[PDB]
DNA sequence: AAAACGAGGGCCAGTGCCGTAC
DNA sequence: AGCGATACGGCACTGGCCCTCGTTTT
């Protein structure tokens, strides 16, 4: 719709005319990333990371090859996570059922001539007895929409799909409502031994691990979920006269930006630079419009900061340069505020730490 | 053409004074010496239309230029003594600018104190400078008290503007500002900072005491230990440079009181303000001292120093001047991070070092160590207390699944953590150092509660005492160590015996681990103590030392590092490059406060010289200012130039790191500074003081005629002559000269001839014996050598002949000897004295060295005065536009344009020319040598440097950052009349 | 060149004995192990802290691996420039501006038939001709001394000058590994070639303000090898003469080091209020901190063993939780750099680590 | 329960060696 | 009478005053 159109001029995404539908964007085929999608994309797969690093008891990180070992690309991210489960037996010292995580960018073939697309995904291949991998499957399921649910602005978008068939036991699917139709943004199945058994026969006595003086090979749990196709979920979970963008605090590119009201003074430029450097030395991704060059209005000053997804716009006068009191300008609220700018580290950090709960 | 040496001079037509039997007997001595092998070199003669002179002789000439230039300054400063004093207001107006108290004290709004003259006194908070913040000024009409724009509550930006106090008047005669230390007060001034002026010149009470009754830094060390026989007699006619001090000394009234709190470097601005009455008060006492002692000072100095050559070259020495540009601040940047980073890497590996050290203290394994064993070693566990109870020992009181349904367990273990935390920080009280690390490495570590805590141990050095012997090993041995000095080094049989005792309990030596590593050493008490090296056992001794001092630590040895003897392990070049980035940064450690804090002032498009903006240059959004070098007048000795920063500031090496300080001074666009380098001026006048007093003519002497024989264009100087023996050129060889002719002392020559040339003692004590010929000879029990034709005699009553003292043959110490015994002011010429304390009335005065050192240095600063008058006078008899002056002792710059920078080169050959006549003229004859009449260098360009080619470290290619090149200058410079229509 | 069997017994390598140094060089290994991966993670975001955060005017970008029209890209320096024109429009045209990106690179090698991948750290930057052996000068020394930090002995990084065949100046990065030099990072300034090739019509919407007058972009470019540099501080942190005691330990920066702490049960066996060590867990990796578990355990050794085990590890510092510590509240602490004993309390352990590494990300 | 004495660390100035210039 | 001289600073080291806290006291 007019969302599509509001990331080109954003730089969500890149410079297209033709390939901008949303077929083209499902489809592996780009005109990649603009900065903000590869900022957002990176916070989204760095949370990602952080969801499955708080999970005990450990999860190795790993890194698989693109290309065929012998002579061709990947389609899957679990051929190469199979490739070192026996190395990775070692340091876990064959002790517990344990996964492997990982975020690469795979490949599929698009359908004149046929194409090649690209898509970024994070996946885990989660090693486990039989007896306990139907249960530690929907273990994940909960875990994995839980996660989806957290920086959703409406948990009713995300759906959760069972399935299965004669290769796979049982599975479940992660769907998300667009509502132009419902579509696929993780899998999650529990494939058998037989994955495994495959490019290691044998002489198999390698694979199976103690599970509490028991030798037992384990089944094999395959999540895998698309970051590219997240990321345009929550662009129009966050599509909101009026068209501002209302991504998740921690997940947001770009939290905050600070221009200047006085005319193009040097002192101006010293305290931008100076709240510059204090905003970036506590970690805040802050835009700098005080450059500026013109600073013309502020209404579409602040509609383009809107359609960034600027968590707080900062407006610093010359009243600054005096008393310290500077323009605080929300965005979910749209609040004109002010206050003093030594104060503001702190309450944006704050702010930040305080979207932290599930 | 003629005697041996002259020009075509018009200062005066007669002359000799042949003196047949004085230049018979000259002859004589040196055909004996004996130099009569001339090269016969006519130097190209040089014909040029002289500037009008004034007539009658050239001193006369000075005499009128120094009293001219200094009689508008003359006659404020007649204002300020004659002064009757309206007394301090009731109180301070708390108003931004200027305001002007006259009946009653009360306040008139005022922007400039519009007077002739007054003292002054400039007040800067500290703790957010350098920016000026209050002042008391009064007048010989009223007082005058100035305040900051610090008077309102703001979050300023100081990119240092013209906030500086405003003095200057405008025209669309004329002032004189007084004040102790007044340089500093001169860089807080709004108007000084500008290209062109100024009519205002300063005067510095401070230089004025020096130059009257002034003491040694020597003599200060021990008068303020005042808290040899006849050494303490001058204890009560002189002081230390402190205001209060010199105050107690020419005011003697009561003693004025310090601000105990020391509120402008200790407070903020913020308790500057509840007390600001107070502080005010404290300035105004300030100014008034400094009125009273300027007022006694003035006649004082007038009398001792009559001559007005003096006055004017202490007033145009106050007014310095150093433009500079955004480059300046590029500097500070990249030469702080080079800094930083070479420090970076020495700290890490030092700490390196010592973390894989702190291994072997388990277990009790560092007594073999035999570089380790002296230090602590402690092992700390400290401290709790009881208060639970009772009677029970608290020391010792495989299954698979996947559950989740437990979700708040980790909740509840982050609940149990909380609990556990907050009932245990009342169990110990201030948190101390790391206790199980050892004594030496809690020290190596900073402090946990420190604001700039850096991990693991910090604080490494170079030059520290523990570190040299956590590593080196020493000198063909193994350990090293220190008590008194540390391991011996630089700067007919005999026997020690040994000893090894036990008693307990003391630290356990190890001396066997030392055997074994002299071992190791060869692989590739006594004996081997004289040139070899070794360690004995305990002791401890000398046992074959040759330095009498000691050093902590050898960090100027390289050649005895990159040499095998000594070196470092573990190891290899870690020693040398270690030795090497201690050499880098040597210059920087000791100047980044002074060189970083060195405040600047910028101009900016509106009050500059638009004739700037319309060359080719803005440049690209840049900024162009400047910074007076704030320099105290006059300092002993004698009355020279004392600057923190700029006197001591490193020249263009290419291992130091700030060593581009020198050359970061650019002149602005259309700008370009000529200076020049007296080569040279302290060894010419000494031999003219030799010549002078020998004879008539200038090559009279034996050590006189070397001096101005030799050429430094493709030639070889006196310096370089001695340089070239072999011989160490050149600075090394005027060193040892300059070193000679104030008491060439047997051993200080030797070592540090020996330093120098690196070879055997032997030789070189051959070398020196040759050349100690200079100073000799000389003079119940004595000295064989007297007045009479023999010592022996039997009962011969002469105690009458006692009194006569002096050396012979090559040099003329005798008349440096000479100004040295008169108890009369000893002030040749000019001929100003100095020093109640140093005058031999009433002193010992056992201070010779200091004396003679006085007299020649004492000419180079008079030489130095007659330069600035000099160059002073025919710079604004003619169009030669930039007469700001930038002085170091022997070499001088001035701040001209790229249109006449050739003219003012011809200017400075003229000065320097005339000067050198001056100096004949005063002793006789007017008549000069050739190879000495004229500078032989000219500097002229962008930046000032040493030589015209220069490179550097930090900035790596100096052409490469915006710079252009330099000239020599010459001879051709010689085709540009004085006259403005040339070329 | 004997401590591999110290990354195959720690997997910060493969644990396969085919790895030798052509393999590793060529980027045809079988991959890294998860301290490895982890390295090169905390590595690569160093790079980009120290790169793209804190200098303006640089801005992330995402080239794809290859080309809509099989071989796959040499150099992200392509797919880079291809974003040229929108990153400008981003920018306002205003000049000099990067955009910098850390992707994975495919090279074609003839094993003397294959190809060798990888991971590479490239920044373009667009910089006015004006100031282009400027910009080229700033960057090789930001460059260097990056790398020249982190390192247990800098004297190895060291840089070279070299000229293009056509006259183009560059630098190159080298590091002395115990066989000789090897090239780590290239530096190029490419005259504005190439984009003019790329955008044959209209030159006008290549002209980037300068300042008062636009002008056509020269193209400055950075690409580092974030394999070979991670190998390199590989070797650079293990240890060389009378030393009389040795013991193995690679000493990495503790900044990007893989696991920070290392959190164990001592005395042992002590149950069950060990849940203390899950909050310990759990408040650490909430700061972010690399947390080592010791539960589940089959040593039951001597404390030599694991403190080897960590300290083949480059585990910066080892916390021991005993019932004393249950009893009062003061853990047990041993560090890396010095093996020393150390008594602190909880809080105090978590705000020390947090301060040890933010202090040691600094001077 | 309550008064007193000794151990630990910072702020202070002095002192010894070294860094530069001219 | 015997002699390196004029300065400007820095950092490393130290003995002593002073405040705080604990070990020891009605
Ligand atoms: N050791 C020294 N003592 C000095 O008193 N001086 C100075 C005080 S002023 C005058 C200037 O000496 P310079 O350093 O410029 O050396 P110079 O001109 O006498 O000799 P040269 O021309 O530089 O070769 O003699 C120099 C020394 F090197
Ligand atoms: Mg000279
Ligand atoms: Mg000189």
Redesign the interface.
């Known amino acids: 719709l007019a969302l599509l159109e509001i990331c080109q001029r954003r ?1 969500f995404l ?2 297209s005319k033709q390939q901008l539908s949303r077929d083209s964007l499902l489809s592996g ?2 005109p ?4 903000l ?3 957002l994309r ?1 916070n989204l797969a760095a949370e990602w990371w952080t969801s499955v ?2 999970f ?3 999860v ?8 065929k070992p012998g002579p ?1 690309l990947r389609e899957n991210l679990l051929h ?1 996570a199979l ?2 489960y026996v ?2 037996l ?2 876990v ?1 064959k ?3 344990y996964g492997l995580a990982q975020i690469g ?1 795979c ?1 599929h073939p698009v359908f004149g001539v046929k ?2 697309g ?1 898509k970024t995904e994070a996946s885990l291949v989660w090693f ?2 039989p007896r ?1 991998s139907n ?2 499957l929907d ?1 994940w399921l909960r875990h994995r929409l839980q996660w989806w649910r957290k920086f959703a602005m409406s948990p009713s978008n995300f759906s959760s799909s069972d399935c299965q068939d004669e290769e796979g036991r049982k599975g479940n699917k992660l769907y998300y409502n667009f509502p132009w139709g419902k579509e696929l943004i993780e899998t999650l199945w529990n494939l058998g031994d037989h994955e495994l058994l495959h490019m290691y026969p044998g002489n198999v006595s390698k694979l199976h691990g103690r ?4 030798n037992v090979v384990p089944c094999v749990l395959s999540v895998n979920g698309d970051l590219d196709r997240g990321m345009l979920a929550y662009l129009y979970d966050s599509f909101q006269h009026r068209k501002v963008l209302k991504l998740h605090p921690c997940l947001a590119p770009i939290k905050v930006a600070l221009d200047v009201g006085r005319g193009p003074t ?2 101006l430029r ?2 931008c630079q100076g709240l ?1 450097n204090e905003l ?1 030395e506590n970690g805040i991704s802050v835009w ?1 419009g005080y ?1 500026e ?1 013109m600073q013309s209005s502020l209404e579409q000053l602040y509609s383009k900061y809107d359609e960034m997804s600027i968590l707080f716009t900062v407006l610093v006068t010359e009243t ?5 009191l500077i323009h605080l300008r929300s965005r979910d609220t749209t609040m004109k505020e002010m206050m003093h ?1 030594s104060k503001l580290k702190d309450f944006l950090i704050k702010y930040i730490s305080s979207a932290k709960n599930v | 053409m003629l005697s041996r040496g002259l020009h075509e001079q018009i200062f005066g037509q007669g002359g000799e004074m042949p003196g047949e039997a004085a230049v018979r007997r000259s002859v004589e001595h040196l055909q004996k010496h004996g130099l009569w092998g001339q090269p016969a070199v006519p130097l190209p003669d040089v014909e040029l239309r002289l500037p009008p002179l004034y007539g009658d002789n050239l001193d006369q000439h000075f005499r009128l230029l120094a009293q001219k230039q200094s009689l508008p300054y003359l006659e404020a400063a007649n204002l300020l003594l004659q002064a009757q004093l309206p007394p301090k207001p009731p109180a301070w107006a708390w108003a931004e600018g200027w305001t002007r108290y006259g009946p009653e004290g009360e306040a008139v709004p005022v922007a400039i104190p519009e007077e002739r003259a007054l003292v002054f006194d400039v007040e800067v908070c500290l703790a957010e400078g350098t920016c000026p913040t209050l002042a008391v000024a009064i007048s010989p009409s009223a007082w005058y008290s100035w305040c900051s724009q610090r008077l309102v509550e ?4 100081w ?1 240092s503007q013209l906030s500086p106090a405003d003095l200057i008047p405008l025209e669309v005669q004329e002032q004189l500002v007084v004040g102790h230390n007044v340089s500093f007060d001169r860089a807080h001034i709004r108007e000084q900072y500008l290209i062109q002026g100024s009519r205002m010149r300063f005067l510095d009470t401070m230089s004025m005491h020096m130059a009257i009754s002034g003491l040694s830094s020597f003599q200060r060390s021990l008068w303020i230990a005042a808290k040899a026989i006849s050494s303490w007699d001058w204890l009560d006619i002189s002081s230390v440079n402190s205001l209060a001090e010199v105050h107690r000394l020419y005011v003697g009234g009561p003693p004025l009181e310090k601000e105990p709190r020391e509120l402008f470097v200790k407070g903020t601005m913020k308790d500057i303000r509840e007390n600001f009455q107070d502080l005010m008060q404290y300035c105004a006492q300030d100014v008034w001292a400094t009125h009273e002692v300027f007022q006694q000072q003035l006649p004082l100095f007038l009398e001792r120093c009559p001559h007005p050559v003096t006055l004017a070259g202490m007033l145009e020495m106050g007014v310095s001047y150093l433009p500079v540009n955004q480059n300046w601040e590029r500097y500070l940047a990249e030469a702080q991070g080079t800094y930083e980073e070479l420090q970076r890497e020495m700290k890490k590996s030092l700490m390196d070092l010592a973390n894989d050290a702190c291994q072997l203290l388990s277990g009790e394994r560092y007594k073999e160590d035999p570089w380790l064993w002296d230090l602590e070693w402690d092992l700390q566990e400290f401290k709790q207390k009881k208060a639970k109870k009772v009677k029970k020992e608290p020391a010792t009181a ?5 559950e ?1 349904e437990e979700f708040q367990q980790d909740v509840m273990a982050r609940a149990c953590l909380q609990k556990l935390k907050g009932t245990t920080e009342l169990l110990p009280k201030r948190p101390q150092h790391l206790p199980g690390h050892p004594g030496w490495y809690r020290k190596l570590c900073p402090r946990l509660d420190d604001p700039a805590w850096t991990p693991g141990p910090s604080l490494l050095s170079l030059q520290m005492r523990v570190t040299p012997k956590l590593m080196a090993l020493t000198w063909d041995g193994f350990p090293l160590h220190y008590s008194e000095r540390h391991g011996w080094g630089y700067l007919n049989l005999a026997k020690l015996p040994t000893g090894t005792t036990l008693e307990s309990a003391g630290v356990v030596c190890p001396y066997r681990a030392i055997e074994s590593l002299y071992r190791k050493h060869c692989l590739e008490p006594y004996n081997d103590v004289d040139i070899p090296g070794c360690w004995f056992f305990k002791l401890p001794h000398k046992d074959g030392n040759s330095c009498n001092v000691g050093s902590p630590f050898a960090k100027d040895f390289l050649p005895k590092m990159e040499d095998g003897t000594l070196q470092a392990g573990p190891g290899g070049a870690s020693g040398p490059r270690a030795l090497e980035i201690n050499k880098m940064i040597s210059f920087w450690r000791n100047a980044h406060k002074r060189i970083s804090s060195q405040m600047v002032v910028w101009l900016p498009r509106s009050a500059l010289p638009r004739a700037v903006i319309r060359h080719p240059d803005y440049d690209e959004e840049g900024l162009y200012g400047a910074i007076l070098p704030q320099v105290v007048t006059a300092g002993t000795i004698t009355r020279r130039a004392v600057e923190p920063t700029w006197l001591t500031a490193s020249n263009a090496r290419p291992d130091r790191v700030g060593s581009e300080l020198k050359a970061m001074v650019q002149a602005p666009p259309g700008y370009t500074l000529v200076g020049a380098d007296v080569d040279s001026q302290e060894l010419w006048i000494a031999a003219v003081l030799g010549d002078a007093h020998f004879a008539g003519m200038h090559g009279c002497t034996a050590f006189g005629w070397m001096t101005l024989q030799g050429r430094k264009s493709r030639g070889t100087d006196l310096h370089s002559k001695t340089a070239t023996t072999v011989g160490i050129s050149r600075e090394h060889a005027k060193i040892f000269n300059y070193g000679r002719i104030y008491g060439a002392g047997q051993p200080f020559a030797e070592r540090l001839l020996m330093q120098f040339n690196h070879r055997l003692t032997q030789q070189e004590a051959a070398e020196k014996a040759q050349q100690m010929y200079a100073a000799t000879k000389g003079l119940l029990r004595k000295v064989q050598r007297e007045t009479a034709r023999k010592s022996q005699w039997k009962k011969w009553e002469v105690v009458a002949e006692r009194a006569w003292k002096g050396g012979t043959e090559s040099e003329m110490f005798n008349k440096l000897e000479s100004i040295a015994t008169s108890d009369i002011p000893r002030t040749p010429v000019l001929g100003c004295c100095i020093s109640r304390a140093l005058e031999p009335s009433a002193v010992q005065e056992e201070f010779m060295t200091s004396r003679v050192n006085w007299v020649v240095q004492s000419s180079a600063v008079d030489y130095l005065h007659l330069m600035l008058v000099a160059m002073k006078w025919l710079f604004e008899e003619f169009a030669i536009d930039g007469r700001f002056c930038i002085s170091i002792h022997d070499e001088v710059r001035y701040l001209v344009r790229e249109e006449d920078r050739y003219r003012a080169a011809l200017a400075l050959q003229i000065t320097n020319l005339l000067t050198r006549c001056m100096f004949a003229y005063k002793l006789g004859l007017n008549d000069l040598p050739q190879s000495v009449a004229f500078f032989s260098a000219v500097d002229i360009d962008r930046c000032l440097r040493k030589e015209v080619t220069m490179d550097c470290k930090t900035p790596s290619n100096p052409t490469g950052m915006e710079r252009r090149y330099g000239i020599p200058q010459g001879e051709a410079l010689d085709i540009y009349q004085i006259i403005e229509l040339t070329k």
């Open positions: 730089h890149s410079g085929c780009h990649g990333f603009g900065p999608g590869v900022e990176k690093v708080v005990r008891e450990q190795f990180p790993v890194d698989a090859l693109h290309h061709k190469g490739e070192h190395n990775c070692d340091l010292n002790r517990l059922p960018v490949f194409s090649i690209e486990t007895p306990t249960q530690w273990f599970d509490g003086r028991k040097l002192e010293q305290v510059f970036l700098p450059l060059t600054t340069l005096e008393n310290g700018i | 703001e979050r300023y930006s990119t495989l299954g698979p699944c996947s989740e």
